[PDB]
DNA sequence: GGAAGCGAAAGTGTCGCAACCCGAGAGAGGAACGATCTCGGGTTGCGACACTTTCGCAACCCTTAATACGTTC
C-alpha cells in the first residue's frame, strides 16, 4: 500500500519485504532489502563492517530455574559472566541458545521449529503463576531496532496455555532465506561450545559421503555446544582433494567417454544404450553440480583452504602450519606445534580443545559469508562457557584479544573464573553473578575497578574476592606477626622478632620481597625509635 | 599397570606402549623407552623397571623389562593369598574425569 | 478458509555398543626357541532413538446487519 511504500522508502526492512512478497518495482523492493543485508564499508582499519549490525541486546528470566525474574543486558562486542555459581552461567547460555535456535531452523526451512522449554526442568519449582518465560531482544540495524523473542512454556493442567511468541524472529530468519533462494547473501553464524567441547579424538575419520560440502551443513549441530570437528576433518580433507584435482576435468573426461559411448551407439551397438543414458546422467549431474557450485557463488577450494589456516594458526599459538598428508592409502591432518611436525591425536589436551573451537567456528564462517573478501569478519553471535578451560597463565592473556582480532564481527557471550583473562577486558563487559542462598539474583552488576591493563593480583581481590596470599599458610603471616613483635619491643629487634627474622630469611631466602619488607621494617623503625628517643 | 596385573593375577599383562604415538617422530633410532626404579625398604632399595617399543615396521624390536615388577607384585599376591596383608593403592585421575 | 503456535504421525539418518578379527609381545614348557594368553587397534552389523517433514486444529468475520416480544431452520 501507500504507507508500507513510505516506511520502506524510509528505510524500513520489513515493510520493503512485504511489498516485495505481495508483487511476486519488484525488482526494486528485492534490491532494497539486498542491499540492507549486504552493504557495509571498510574502516581505518582494514575491517569490513556491516552498515546494519546484528546482536542480542537484552535478555530476560521469569521464573526460570532459580530465577524469579532477571535481566541481562549484552555488549554488542563482548560480554563476560563472572560468579563463583557456575550452574546458574550456564542456564544463562542455555536461554539463549534455545532462543538461537529458532533463527537457525527459520533459515534452514520455512516454518522450522527452534526448541522449547521443559515442563520439568526449565520452570521454577516455586513459581505462583505456574509458567516461565524466556524474553529476548534482537538489533538488526536502524530499520529493525528491535526483534523480540519469547520462549514460554506453563504447567500441566493450568487453566490457561502460555505459548511462545516467535513471529518476528521467524519474519526475519524468513528475509534471510527468501533473499538468499534469488540471489547468495551472507549468513550470521550462531554457535554454542560448553566444556563437552573437551572430548578425546576419533583417529579414524569418515569417508566423504558429500553432505560436509554443503554449504547448510554450517548449521548442523551449531548450537549443540562440543562443535563437530570431525565434520572440520572431512570437510578439510575434501578441499585438500579437490585443490589437487581439477574440477570439470571429470567433466571433461565424462563429456569424452559420453562421446565415444554415442560414437559405438551409432555404430550398431544397441546393447550399450543402456549404459549411455546412465553415463549422460551422471554427465548432467556433474554439470549441475558445477553450475550449482557455479550459482552459489562460493569461493575457490584453494581460498576457503587457506582462509582457514591462516585463522587457525593466527589464534592458536602453538601451531604455524597445518596440512594434509597422503601417507599409507590414508588422508592424514598433519600440524607444526611447537616446531615439530605431529598429528592431530599428538596434540596436548588443550591445543586440541582450543584448535578445535576455531576450525569448527573458521569452517562455519567461511561456509555462510562467500561475499566478503575475509569470510571471518561476517556476522554472529557466539557463546562460550570456561573460556579458559585447559590454558596455561600466558595463553589465557592472548586468548580474548586473539579471538576478536580474528573474528571482529562477531558478538562473543563467554563465561570465566580467570583473574589474567579479566585484565584483557574492559569492566563495562563485565557482568557479575552474586545469587542469593535461593539462587535468585535481579541484575547482574559491573566491577567498580577497571579491569582492562591492571594488575591480576588486585583482579584477584578486588573482583574476584580471594586474597593474594594463601590465608591457610603459616608462613603468609610471618611477616604481619614480625611487624607486631617489632612493635611491641619499642623497634628493637629481640630474641623472639630475631627468631622470627631469621625464619623469614631460612624460608623465603636472602634475595626474597619477604625479607626485604623485613629489613625495611627493621630501618625504619630504628629510625623512628630513635627520633623519639631524641624527642 | 605391570603391578596391578600381577597382584590380581600370576603372570598377569600390564599394558604397553604405542608404537603409533609414543615414539618420538624424529627419532634416528626408530624406539622409545619408559626407565622407571622403584624403592621398597632397604631390603629391596633398587626394583628397576623398563616398558620399550619399537616404531612400526623396525626390522629389529625391543623388549620391555617387567621381571623385577612381575616378582615383586608375586611376593604380595602370594603372602596375601596365606595370610591377609594391606595392599599398595594405584591410581590415575586424568582430565577425563569431568567427563559425564 | 485457515493466522500463529503447537504436536501427532510417520519416515530417515546417526551413532554407540557388542561381537568379532588381527598382529604384537612376554616368555611356559624345560634349557632352544617360542606355548598360551592378553594388549591395542580396526571392522561390521544392529537397533534405539534423534531428527525431519507433513498435516491439521480454527483466530479473524472482510466497506457492505438490525434492533416490539416469542418459536423454528
Redesign the interface.
Known sequence: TKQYERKAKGGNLLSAFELYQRNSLVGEWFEMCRDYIQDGHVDESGIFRPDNAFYLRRLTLKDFRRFSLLEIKLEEDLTVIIGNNGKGKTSILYAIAKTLSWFVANILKEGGSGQRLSEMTDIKNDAEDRYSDVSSTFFFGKGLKSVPIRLSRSALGTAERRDSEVKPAKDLADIWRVINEVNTINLPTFALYN?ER???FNRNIKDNTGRREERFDAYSQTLGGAGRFDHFVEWYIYLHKRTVSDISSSIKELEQQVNDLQRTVDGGMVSVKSLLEQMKFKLSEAIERNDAAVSSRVLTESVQKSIVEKAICSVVPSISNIWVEMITGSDLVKVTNDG????I??LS?GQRVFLSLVADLARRMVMLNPLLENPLEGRGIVLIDEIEL?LHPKWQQEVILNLRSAFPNIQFIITTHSPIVLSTIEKRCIREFEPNDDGDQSFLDSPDMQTKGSENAQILEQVMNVHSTPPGIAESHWLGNFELLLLDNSGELDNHSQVLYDQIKAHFGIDSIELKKADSLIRINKMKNKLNKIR
Open positions: 566444556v573437551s572430548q578425546p615439530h611436525d605431529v598429528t591425536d599428538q589436551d585447559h
